[PDB]
Amino acid sequence: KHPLKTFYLAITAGVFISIAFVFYITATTGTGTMPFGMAKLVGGICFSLGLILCVVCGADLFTSTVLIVVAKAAKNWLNVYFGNLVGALLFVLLMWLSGEYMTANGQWGLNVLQTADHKVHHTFIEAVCLGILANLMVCLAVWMSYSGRSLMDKAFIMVLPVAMFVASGFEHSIANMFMIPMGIVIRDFASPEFWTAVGSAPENFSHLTVMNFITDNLIPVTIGNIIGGGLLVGLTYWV
Amino acid sequence: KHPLKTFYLAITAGVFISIAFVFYITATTGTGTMPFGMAKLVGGICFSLGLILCVVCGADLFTSTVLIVVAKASGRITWGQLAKNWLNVYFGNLVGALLFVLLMWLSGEYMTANGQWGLNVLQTADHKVHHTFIEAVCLGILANLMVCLAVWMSYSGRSLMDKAFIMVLPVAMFVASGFEHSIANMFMIPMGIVIRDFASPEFWTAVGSAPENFSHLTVMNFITDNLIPVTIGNIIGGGLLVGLTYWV
């Protein structure tokens, strides 16, 4: 009930979704030769860890449970959204300090750069629509989970729905709070050895900036997320 | 039993099956060098997402639960009764598919994997409009046999695990084998037509093809060459399982 509690559980959820994207990046590092959809699918299955963490442990992931809230019957969102952000950024910091970006001869870092960079090149509408698509999947996953009895039920019913949105490259704003900043940090602070390893340079990723993150992704994706969850809320009421 | 509620649940199921096909397209994108059956099997496993969604969330997928209706009524119903909501669920389902088509087109998703995502839809849609009426009805009955069986098995489950994961194999079987489900095609084929009709020139370049390569992808061909025979096959397929179940 405490707003402090919620804030701590939202930070926790931010850390959890970062764990998920880290797993995704790890799983998909060096998979450029493998068929696109298969590599992404495996990445997405791995990503589901994060949602499983949130549900089993009771963390508060921005809007993920909106259908639960309606079923058992709201500016708390600002609290959760920002707590989420704080947790993601703390994990960005921890991941940077661990040296992980040099994993697989720097390919781990490159995977983050290219994944982060992809995410700031949508138009506003497609970003919104991918935000809609992503949260539809998350909210549905969380809903199914709640009809679950056992741990197995609650965790594993969420694997397919999550893997689908992730493998499909749909956009989740909180997940993005880890990924794009992680990309920005690497782009700005990577050693010369990393660039040599990876056959690239900072200027090849010139759109990976804070500004571009906020405007080309975070805003439209957050809007899209909100709409996605809203569509489900509004479908729920009629029923 | 409210007519408008099932309409919303039908629209929901349409979105659910569209989600299934999108997932299928995603998983099978760029699988060209992969053994045909292996790629198709994995796509089929992913596709099961849609039926898991339908059943667990309580959505209304055209005829998928017909076997249940019988046993629930302890065997008390007639022809003219078992299809009151049928055109209701059907067109509702269609709206769901079409809506998700619009949304998927707006997402710019067809440019995924250098346009290979889009190309996958083109080819998948294209394949579904080159069937003989007969073989489409047959693929149609084969598909619905698998869906109805999957749904009947689900209903004997207790846990969430039971209800969901018993449907994976039978669903994945019909999808990997390229059997025909009318509603799922309401997304796939119009998705292909939209892409064909409205794809940028850069897509065509990236992929290395042309709109003239998919000259059979028209709205009319969709209706007459697929939707009609497949729907009829879906119906006969569900027909058989009903007659068998009855005598029990």
Place this chain on the structure above:
Amino acid sequence: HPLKTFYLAITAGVFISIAFVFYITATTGTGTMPFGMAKLVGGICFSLGLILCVVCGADLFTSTVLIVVAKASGRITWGQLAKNWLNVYFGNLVGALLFVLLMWLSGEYMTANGQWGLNVLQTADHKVHHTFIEAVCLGILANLMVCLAVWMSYSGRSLMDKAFIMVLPVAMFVASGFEHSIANMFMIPMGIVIRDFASPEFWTAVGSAPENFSHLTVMNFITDNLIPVTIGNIIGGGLLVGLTYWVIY
């Protein structure tokens, strides 16, 4: 009873055919893949069929013989445990054949540039080239697995238990090329049908001719596979029945 049984037998023939269709789809185009891996996957898909039989209460020839012995409690005779075997066997056959017609009508055989169809031909053909004794032993092997799978399934207390306990034992027999008579009622005839009806196009895409599969005939199916395999399946069941009987008494 007998009429209800017959239909549940047709049902199982349908189910077992679905199993093999899935197997063929899964293994189509897997010539570059390691043999065992491709076959293992096909066998996991094939398990659908038995899952279908057990969960929907369908009647697959002899598959439950162990459950019946257990239910009798050792108060049963071998002479009673075979009245409706011929009924089930025949019903299974009808269902398998009906599915052969449905698969042929679908034109499914052209899938993957004729490769699906070719899969069936090569699979069917291989099944008609055993020695009689090879066929019998392969039949013993397949039915040990089927009977064990079904037996484990019956100790289950959820859908998950009953269905998934069978995946491994079924995959093992299918992946291993063991011989199950009912499954064969679909595969070999499906192959005979494709061979004697395939279009010139199929043969061109496939790169073969009907004369490459000269052993695929109804009579060769009956004598070189079905008889010995059926005998084998029966013996495989008998061994387990005999074993169970001793452990009980």
Place this chain on the structure above:
Amino acid sequence: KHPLKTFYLAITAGVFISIAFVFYITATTGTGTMPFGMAKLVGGICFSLGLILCVVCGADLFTSTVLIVVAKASGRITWGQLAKNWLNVYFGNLVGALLFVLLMWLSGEYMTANGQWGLNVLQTADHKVHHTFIEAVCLGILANLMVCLAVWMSYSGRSLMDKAFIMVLPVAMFVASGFEHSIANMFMIPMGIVIRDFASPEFWTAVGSAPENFSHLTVMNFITDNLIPVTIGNIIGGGLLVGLTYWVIYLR
């Protein structure tokens, strides 16, 4: 109780473990191109079927349930009691494995995949007879640690799902890693000797080898270089866990 019941159940487990190894051979046939550990892992997963059969159906696999026995008695039990049926089970296990060797030979399975199935058996059996005595013991210790742990975990299960699938990882681990289980080897190595001695000229031509290339595969080598030291290790590994169990139960 009753030596005869136990004997038949042991025959059954010997068949069960033979089924396990057949599945492993089938799954790993033609996996020369695959990464080694990946092929071995998949075979190991397939192999667990054998232990699943033994536990679910109630068969008696040499020493596999020794920790259950100790726990059910609350450690109020002597080694003589623990080992009371070992000779009988070991023998019965052997009879079941040899019966399965015969059936597999009569099946003609060795020609599967143009003889590669049979070749896989030969190479697998041959590898198992080239250990030093100490290596074979330690590999035996390792194998039976895993089997007994697997069976231990299975007994805390409350559903068929629990009991079966909890053994997958620990069995796959011992198998993928090439640890040595004596009963499993009663199928595998004699299967090798049999193929080596009775394979057709067509087989040898198909796989491009000759019986001369597998001259270590004899009954006496099987017994002295594998079965004896592996059986010793198996017992030692079970023993180590039994010791551990006694003590953890003793410490009130």
Place this chain on the structure above:
Amino acid sequence: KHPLKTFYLAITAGVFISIAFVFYITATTGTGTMPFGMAKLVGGICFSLGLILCVVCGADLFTSTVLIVVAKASGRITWGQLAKNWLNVYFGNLVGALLFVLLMWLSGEYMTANGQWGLNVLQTADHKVHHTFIEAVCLGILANLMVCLAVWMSYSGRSLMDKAFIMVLPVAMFVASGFEHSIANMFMIPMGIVIRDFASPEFWTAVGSAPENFSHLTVMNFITDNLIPVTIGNIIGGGLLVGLTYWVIYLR
């Protein structure tokens, strides 16, 4: 509660985690041509066996159950109470790991796959002593976060499937990602040091390398460049979660 029992269970957890890393080495042997991430993920999934063993059999793995201890007192316990038997458990853990090093060494396993199994250990171990101190601490924080969370989730489970399988993903995650767990490293790094110091000439030949290419693989480099910083990190990782847990519980 008994100290000697705890010690035996800590030796046991050391064995279980050693088993986990052996399985990881087995599955990833010869995987150099697979996508890096796929191979490590598979390895990581195999690795989860170790933790499944610890939880199912009630062995004591350094700090892994710290969150559960906090929950069982509704957060009404002190830091000093939490670390009460950390020394006992840490040393038991170590004894168990080292024992399994000795056994794996005597098994001759390092020659598996033409020495590739042993090469896999060398390179894995060697990697683990080339972090900066800060990196090793952070990698240690990261590994123990995932371990403590997995165990926490496992404790809300009711069936055996629940308790075991809920742990697969978070364990594979830390392992596939190359995060650093101190007890696991008590097997891995000493295993590499042993292979380096005692490998036959046949090994280095089959493997195309030499001991001088692994000059950092020493007991001292193990302690100072990995064990100390990684252990500190493991502790900080558990500490973070325990602190979060107090507050969640201290706010209704």
